[PDB]
Amino acid sequence: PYTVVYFPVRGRCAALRMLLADQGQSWKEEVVTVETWQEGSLKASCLYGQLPKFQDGDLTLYQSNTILRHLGRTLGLYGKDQQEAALVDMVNDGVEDLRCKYISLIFTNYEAGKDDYVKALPGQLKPFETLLSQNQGGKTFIVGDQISFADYNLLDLLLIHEVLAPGCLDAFPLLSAYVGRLSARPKLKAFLASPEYVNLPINGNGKQ
Amino acid sequence: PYTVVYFPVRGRCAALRMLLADQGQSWKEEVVTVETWQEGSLKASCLYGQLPKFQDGDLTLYQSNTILRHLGRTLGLYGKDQQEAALVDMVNDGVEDLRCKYISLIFTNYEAGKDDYVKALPGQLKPFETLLSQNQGGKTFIVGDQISFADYNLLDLLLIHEVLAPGCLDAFPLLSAYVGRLSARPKLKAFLASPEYVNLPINGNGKQ
Ligand SMILES: CCCCCCSC[C@H](NC(=O)CC[C@H]([NH3+])C(=O)O)C(=O)NCC(=O)O
Ligand SMILES: CCCCCCSC[C@H](NC(=O)CC[C@H]([NH3+])C(=O)O)C(=O)NCC(=O)O
């Protein structure tokens, strides 16, 4: 089946976990503690010396987006045709770029860079509002009318930003409706409210 | 047909151009000058306010890797099955990570960070040597036995690093043989030697 090996944080696994849950998939969690990591053996065995590590049968993967695209490909959450598949990538890549800046703020300079980051947020979120406005008035999903791996990843990005800069979505009616709508999906709602998600820290450094 | 809109540099378009050339595809180049860019109109029309921008018929794409995956998907350079498609992603993601550090060195702190970067290079390149050693002794491609978009992207990464730290591939027999082998492909060889590639600067800041 599925197995995700990662630290005891949401981080780069939050989105794929949401995906697995909403799709009614069963998976195993292998928690890696800082002590175990600092031992060195696991780090060395990891291709790019990092986690998350994922296992699907005897297929061992690395790189969060690779896991997302894999599930998306295998579970049919990658658009209805090639054109949509490309637009799904365009969204995910955009999500990835903003996630990098978020991760850099959280770990590199939270105290001094928080104010500038928040001021720049509207411009960074705007593109997703625009994408949504061009797809059935943003009443369905980010691309096409069926959900895709990019939705789960975007949803996480928006959620974590709500905690960082509460109210950042008030200026974006479509994104706000989008978050609420998807968060309400039965399997997803139950997952987001469970101890498995709630009691895990967003990032590992105690900052959010 | 195909149209790539980008600045007069190789940068994030080098790989997709190599892909187009080697596959015998025709494309149009729309060169964007700093003056045109600083005018503002084009920047605003771009989804994430950035280039490269790509057009395939009336399909308008953004994000370099999205263009690579698109060509890969449409041209059959994405593995022979789902498993390979996932390994192709794992490689490309790895290439992307290292490209980001390269881009950060080139634009953020070349003078002070060049020495530390080069020292760390072997560890960063090693994973690709390892991947190659596990695939038919690294005698064919990075994943499977047919070429994929990840090859073109990896090939570029290696080439640009040869200029940054000449000889960095001497410690990696498989990667070196790989670069030479692919650079020798007829259409690709002719492209790499043409004025269209040679007279374009790698990055835009005059550093390499
Ligand atoms: C301690 C709690 C905080 C954990 C933060 C998240 S783990 C961060 C880091 N992993 C990554 O950055 C993964 C990046 C990779 N590109 C992906 O998308 O999967 C890692 O393994 N780092 C370990 C290392 O590189 O030594
Ligand atoms: C002047 C010559 C130097 C050009 C350097 C390359 S262009 C850099 C930048 N674009 C990107 O970083 C693209 C990143 C995007 N994630 C991708 O992969 O396509 C840009 O458009 N920047 C313009 C802007 O953001 O204003």
Q: Which of B14, B7, B23, B52 is nearest to B160 (CA)?
A: B14
Domain containing residue A58:
1-77+186-207
Nearest to A59 among B69, B86, B100 (CB): B86
* Cα B113 to Cα B105: distance, rounded to the nearest angstrom: 6
Query: What backbone torsions phi and psi does residue B60 show, to the nearest 5 degrees?
Result: -105, 120
Please list the residues that pair with B6 across neighbouring strands: B31
Roughly what angle, to the nearest 10 degrees, separates helices A82-108 and B64-75? 150
**Method of elucidation:** X-ray
Residue B112, number of CB atoms within 10 A of its CB: 10
The CATH number of whichever domain residue A99 belongs to comes to: 1.20.1050.10
Q: Do A160 and A83 belong to one domain?
A: yes
Q: Do B12 and B35 belong to one domain?
A: yes
Residues A198, A165, A151: CA angle, nearest 5 degrees: 60
B141: helix, strand or coil: coil
Q: Do B124 and B147 belong to one domain?
A: yes
Q: Do B113 and B47 belong to one domain?
A: no
Q: How many helices (H) and strands (E) does chain B have?
A: 10, 4
Whether the CB-CB separation of A128 and A155 falls below 8 Å is answered with: no
Chain B residues whose beta carbon lies within 8 Å of the beta carbon of residue A63: 89-90, 93-94
Q: Do A69 and A137 belong to one domain?
A: no
A5: helix, strand or coil: strand
Residues A86, A4, A46: CA angle, nearest 5 degrees: 90
Q: Using CB atoms within 10 A of its CB, is residue A48 exposed (0-12), middle (13-18) or buried (19+)?
A: middle
* Cα A61 to Cα A13: distance, rounded to the nearest angstrom: 13
Please list the residues that pair with A53 across neighbouring strands: A5, A62
What's the Cα-to-Cα distance from A49 to each of B123, B127, B182, rounded to whole Å? Answer: 10, 9, 28
B200: helix, strand or coil: coil
* Cα B5 to Cα B79: distance, rounded to the nearest angstrom: 28
Q: Do A179 and A191 belong to one domain?
A: no
Q: Do A169 and A193 belong to one domain?
A: no
Please list the residues that pair with A22 across neighbouring strands: none
Q: Do B48 and B91 belong to one domain?
A: no
Interface of B with A (CB under 8 A): 47-49, 59, 61-63, 65-66, 69-70, 73-74, 82-83, 85-86, 89-90, 93-94, 97, 100, 123, 127, 130-131
Q: Do B155 and B120 belong to one domain?
A: yes
Resolution of the model in angstroms? 2.5
The DSSP line for B4-27 is EEE-SS-GGGHHHHHHHHHTT--E
Q: Do B27 and B106 belong to one domain?
A: no
Please list the residues that pair with B60 across neighbouring strands: B55
Q: Which of B17, B9, B5 is nearest to B41 (CA)?
A: B5
A151: helix, strand or coil: helix
Whether the CB-CB separation of B67 and B16 falls below 8 Å is answered with: yes
Distance of CA A116 to the CA centre of its chain: 23
What's the Cα-to-Cα distance from B104 to each of A184, B100, B108, B203, B207, rounded to whole Å? Answer: 40, 6, 5, 11, 12
Query: Which of B4, B5, B7, B47 for mutating ligand 2's site (highest number of atoms within 8 Å of CB)?
Result: B7
